[PDB]
Amino acid sequence: MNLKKYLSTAPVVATLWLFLTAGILIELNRFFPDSLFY
């Protein structure tokens, strides 16, 4: 019940989100490596 309220705090959301955008960049740089165009 209050566990999601812990998962709504500043650092936990910042790691579940920057982990996600970091995953967007790392998974988007294995699939499309050396992207200097566009």
* Amino acid identity for residue 25 in this structure: L
Q: Which does 15 bind (CB under 5 to 8 A by kind): other proteins, ligand CLA, none?
A: none
Residues binding ligand CLA (CB under 6 A): 19-20, 23-25, 27-29, 34-36
Asked whether 13 and 7 are in contact (CB, 8 A), the reply is yes
Pairwise CA distance, residues 10 & 15, whole Å: 9
Residues 7-36 that bind other proteins (CB under 8 A): 8-10, 13, 26, 29-30, 33-34, 36
The answer to whether the CB of 21 falls within 8 A of the CB of 29 is no
Q: Which does 3 bind (CB under 5 to 8 A by kind): other proteins, ligand CLA, none?
A: other proteins
